[PDB]
Amino acid sequence: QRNEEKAQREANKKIEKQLQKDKQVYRATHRLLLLGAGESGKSTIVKQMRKATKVQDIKNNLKEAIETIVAAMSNLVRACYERSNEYQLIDCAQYFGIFETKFQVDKVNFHMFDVGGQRDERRKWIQCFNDVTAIIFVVASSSYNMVIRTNRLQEALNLFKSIWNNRWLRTISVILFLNKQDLLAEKVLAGKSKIEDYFPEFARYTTPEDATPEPGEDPRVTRAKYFIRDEFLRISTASGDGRHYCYPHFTCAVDTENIRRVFNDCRDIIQRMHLRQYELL
Amino acid sequence: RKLVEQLKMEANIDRIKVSKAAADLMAYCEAHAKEDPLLTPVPASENPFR
Amino acid sequence: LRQEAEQLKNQIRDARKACADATLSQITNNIDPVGRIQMRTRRTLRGHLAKIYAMHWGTDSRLLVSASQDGKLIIWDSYTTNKVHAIPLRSSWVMTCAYAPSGNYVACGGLDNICSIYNLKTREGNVRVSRELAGHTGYLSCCRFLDDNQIVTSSGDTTCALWDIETGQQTTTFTGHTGDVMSLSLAPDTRLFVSGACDASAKLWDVREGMCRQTFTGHESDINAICFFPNGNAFATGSDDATCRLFDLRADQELMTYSHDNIICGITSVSFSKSGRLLLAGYDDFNCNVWDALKADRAGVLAGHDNRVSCLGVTDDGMAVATGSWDSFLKIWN
Amino acid sequence: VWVVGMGIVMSLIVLAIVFGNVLVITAIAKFERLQTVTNYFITSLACADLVMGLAVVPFGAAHILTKTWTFGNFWCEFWTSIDVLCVTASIETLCVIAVDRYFAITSPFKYQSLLTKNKARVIILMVWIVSGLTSFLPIQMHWYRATHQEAINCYAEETCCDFFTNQAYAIASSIVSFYVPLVIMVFVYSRVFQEAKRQLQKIDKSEGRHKALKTLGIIMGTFTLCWLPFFIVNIVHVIQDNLIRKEVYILLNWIGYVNSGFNPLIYCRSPDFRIAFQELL
Ligand SMILES: CN[C@@H]1CCc2c(ccc(O)c2O)[C@H]1O
């Protein structure tokens, strides 16, 4: 019986050695999360952060889904694009599980996770994401007018409020992205939809005294963007105790600087966690 | 729809008074109490642990 | 349509009330209390890299199977605290694991749609996946084995399914939960099982018939854990609400509730003893609890773990209770 | 009756040091949650302070209270060597803790791979080895013995045993023990304070809606005020013999001693440490 025990102990030793070797790699890497509505633009960030016939078939399926959405809008009480704001949610169509992404920046291995749930209203599986360094919240700031049968942006704020105030995600920070900046600029420049029409606080809201506008932004676009950012930051910091912070970002549809922004945000998150752990901040 | 029919089917089931079920469960627990090594402390020699 | 359903619900509630003659506490008020029990760890296990969420004891009282979020499902021998097998997983996120009654198979769930079943006893001692169960359309939450060939899974699609390993397709699909089902526990005869969803309703299913025979929705908050009494006529449900309740199958109604003023946290795992006298229940707080089933009085507290306890396990022989937590270290309690 | 108060104070200091270090070590070793790569340095410092407060403090108090030293020459040399070893190990461990904090804050992504349990134990072993090399070796072989006529009879006499040292050993011991760790700690704490100030400025700029200065002040000033005068007079009395008397040297040395008791109070201030202390006591 001694030989069996010795062999089993040797197997234990080999398993422990392999487990330590894998633990080194596991501790080396970092974990992130993708979160937001289907129309928020998480796919655009995924492409930015990271079978031609199959692509054409997917495009044809998207066109068929656009036709189905047009039929669904016709069920409700080029001409359909104007009413598409209040119509059923669909892809842009203006041309006329879980996903894991592994990318490394500056020899630092990051690992990216997608939500994978279209209708995860309960979203109670979020309790298992406590080892992640940050939560990348992707929301389309231009969706302030596209209502869902409350506005989509208000639903985004409610989701963000529920996520920020969690009994498990207290130590988890949030990286925030605001896509559709050009779409928001186009919609605010035109008078078809006003921010004050659906958000009453914008009428009394004024641009911050200290703000950094791009050289090619009208004052109204900057006011709208900063109002949305200020609302998100207020929701974030209303109950914040310094353990975790929100990192707003103004990003366009196409931009290669998102990866560097995520890298800097994660580095700042780790630095601030280390500073608070030792009580130097 | 089918939910109403399923609930109606589930409602028509035999019922035994809670007193009888509680008495039977207590009798089983008392009869099989000695077999459990958790309620009665395990002897050191007979214990596979320590 | 709705009026008929409301009338039927009122009738079933009236029938349940009429069937309630004497409560369990009234009958067992004269029984001798179990008394304070001293439970101390005998062998503490270690080796995991992240938080475990579930584990399952073996048919033999020795072997363990536990899965964590590091992506590694490693099999342990509780008698010697030495690892036997280490099985890497395709998905880094898992929510459950199971151990075959014969012991030749190990299956684990995951946050993904896929449920994987692994082969333990093979030529040259190589571990590999036999089949990848697919098509459940939701994050999986629990897995148990009827035999070496049949496995029942519960997912976020509010449906419990019974699978066939050889064919790879679910034989029967159970539906009726408004919210997503989280936990299930088979009967000793492997003919009945119950499932606890997020809508506080714990329904009983029949594997052969495929229809929910009974439905117990007497709870308030979502149900996180569930387990049969060893007799098979009763089961206890864990929940995010601090109360832990023991239901009945022949009485079709709730018998007792286990609530204390101090405890305000949730419950993650519940498991009876061999005799059913002690109801161990892991809590969201770092400590678990032990309850007298026939008296609803707490008889101990175990604060060994440094994080939230996620899983409980009592051996088929009833020797030791093994509890894990979000801390990587496992502990065997006796 | 005048010496009664001094004896009571010495006994109280020894008891406080022993109790504090014993409690810190018991908390660090009993609970697995406190067992951390960065906590190994803390428990090494606690062990060094416990060893010093057990060996040097009681025998030094006995020497101070009663002028005659009843033990043998070899035992007094051993006591002096233990004193030097403990002081050097404590200061080197404080320097290593500061270096570890600087690596954790300034280089967050590379900190996980740089610091490991094996690496931490190697660092601690190297620290203790270099402390022993500068304490055991130059003292046991009588390399530190003076050359002038005075203290030669004291070396010969069993009753007299005082710290009389040649020119070479004083400066070398000071450099190995305090001066180099002082410079390293000052640099790696100025860098950390700059990083903390930058992070606080970034927080203030990002969100419109101190502690670091106080923490750094405590950590650096306690050690500096406790040890720097002793080493400066250690340099002075060799540079100028007539400047430094015996009483000043003894009192500064005992202030350096009691710094060891003060250390765990300001270093083991984490909330987890407080919870462990509450549970143990
Ligand atoms: C008599 N006590 C000794 C004397 C000088 C000395 C000490 C500690 C560290 C050093 O580097 C020293 O040079 C003191 O603890």
UniProtKB/Swiss-Prot annotation, chain A:
How does the record say this protein sits in the membrane? Lipid-anchor
Major site of localization recorded for this protein: membrane
Q: Where in the cell is it found?
A: Cell membrane
User: Which residues does Mg(2+) bind?
Assistant: 43
Indicate, by first and last residue, each region the UniProt record lists as having compositional bias (Basic and acidic residues). Answer: 1-12
Its Gene Ontology cellular component terms are: cytoplasm; cytosol; extracellular exosome; heterotrimeric G-protein complex; membrane; plasma membrane; trans-Golgi network membrane
Biological processes, Gene Ontology terms: activation of adenylate cyclase activity; adenylate cyclase-activating adrenergic receptor signaling pathway; adenylate cyclase-activating dopamine receptor signaling pathway; adenylate cyclase-activating G protein-coupled receptor signaling pathway; bone development; cellular response to catecholamine stimulus; cellular response to glucagon stimulus; cellular response to prostaglandin E stimulus
Report the sequence similarity comment from the record: Belongs to the G-alpha family. G(s) subfamily.
- PANTHER family attached here? GTP-BINDING PROTEIN ALPHA SUBUNIT, GUANINE NUCLEOTIDE-BINDING PROTEIN G(S) SUBUNIT ALPHA
Q: What is this protein called?
A: Guanine nucleotide-binding protein G(s) subunit alpha isoforms short
> Which species does this protein come from?
Homo sapiens (Human)
UniProtKB/Swiss-Prot annotation, chain B:
Q: Which residues of the full protein are shown?
A: 13 to 62 of 71
Reply yes or no: does the keyword Acetylation apply.
Answer: yes
Its protein name is Guanine nucleotide-binding protein G(I)/G(S)/G(O) subunit gamma-2
- Please give one Gene Ontology molecular function term for this protein: G-protein beta-subunit binding
Q: Which organism is it from?
A: Homo sapiens (Human)
N-terminal signal peptide: none
GO biological process terms, alphabetically, are: adenylate cyclase-activating dopamine receptor signaling pathway; cellular response to catecholamine stimulus; cellular response to prostaglandin E stimulus; fibroblast proliferation; G protein-coupled receptor signaling pathway
> Which keywords does this Swiss-Prot/TrEMBL entry list?
Acetylation, Cell membrane, Host-virus interaction, Lipoprotein, Membrane, Methylation, Prenylation, Transducer
Tell me if Ribosomal protein is a UniProt keyword of this record.
no
Cellular compartment(s): Cell membrane
From Swiss-Prot, chain C:
Single GO term (MF): GTPase activity
- Phosphohistidine modification sites are 260
Describe the effect of residue 24 to F.
In MRD42; uncertain significance; no effect on protein abundance; no effect on complex formation with gamma subunit; no effect on trimer formation with alpha and gamma subunits; no effect on receptor-driven G protein activation
Q: Where are the WD repeats?
A: 40-88, 89-134, 135-175, 176-217, 218-261, 262-303, 304-334
* SUPFAM superfamilies reported for this sequence: WD40 repeat-like
- UniProt PTM comment: Phosphorylation at His-260 by NDKB contributes to G protein activation by increasing the high energetic phosphate transfer onto GDP.
* CDD domains for this protein: WD40
Summarizing the annotation, the consequence of altering residue 88 to S is: In MRD42; decreases receptor-driven G protein activation; decreases trimer formation with alpha and gamma subunit; no effect on protein abundance;no effect on complex formation with gamma subunit
GO CC terms on record? Answer: cytoplasm; cytosol; extracellular exosome; extracellular vesicle; heterotrimeric G-protein complex; lysosomal membrane; membrane; photoreceptor disc membrane
UniProt keywords, alphabetically: Acetylation, Disease variant, Host-virus interaction, Intellectual disability, Phosphoprotein, Repeat, Transducer, WD repeat
Altering residue 90 to L: what's the impact?
In MRD42; decreases receptor-driven G protein activation; decreases trimer formation with alpha and gamma subunit; no effect on protein abundance; no effect on complex formation with gamma subunit
User: Which cysteines form disulfides?
Assistant: none
**Family the UniProt entry places it in:** Belongs to the WD repeat G protein beta family.
Name this protein carries in UniProt: Guanine nucleotide-binding protein G(I)/G(S)/G(T) subunit beta-1
Gene designation: GNB1
Curated annotation (Swiss-Prot), chain D:
What cystine pairs are annotated? 76-161, 154-160
Membrane-crossing residues? 5-28, 42-65, 77-99, 121-144, 167-190, 216-239, 247-270
GO terms for biological process, alphabetical: adenylate cyclase-activating adrenergic receptor signaling pathway; adenylate cyclase-modulating G protein-coupled receptor signaling pathway; adrenergic receptor signaling pathway; AMPA selective glutamate receptor signaling pathway; bone resorption; brown fat cell differentiation; cell surface receptor signaling pathway; cellular response to amyloid-beta
Q: Where is it localised?
A: Cell membrane; Early endosome; Golgi apparatus
Subunit note:
Binds NHERF1 and GPRASP1. Interacts with ARRB1 and ARRB2. Interacts with SRC. Interacts with USP20 and USP33. Interacts with VHL; the interaction, which is increased on hydroxylation of ADRB2, ubiquitinates ADRB2 leading to its degradation. Interacts with EGLN3; the interaction hydroxylates ADRB2 facilitating VHL-E3 ligase-mediated ubiquitination. Interacts (via PDZ-binding motif) with SNX27 (via PDZ domain); the interaction is required when endocytosed to prevent degradation in lysosomes and promote recycling to the plasma membrane. Interacts with CNIH4. Interacts with ARRDC3.
Its protein name is Beta-2 adrenergic receptor
Q: Which organism is it from?
A: Homo sapiens
Lineage at the top is: Eukaryota, Metazoa, Chordata, Craniata, Vertebrata
- Shown portion of the complete protein runs from 31 to 340 of 413
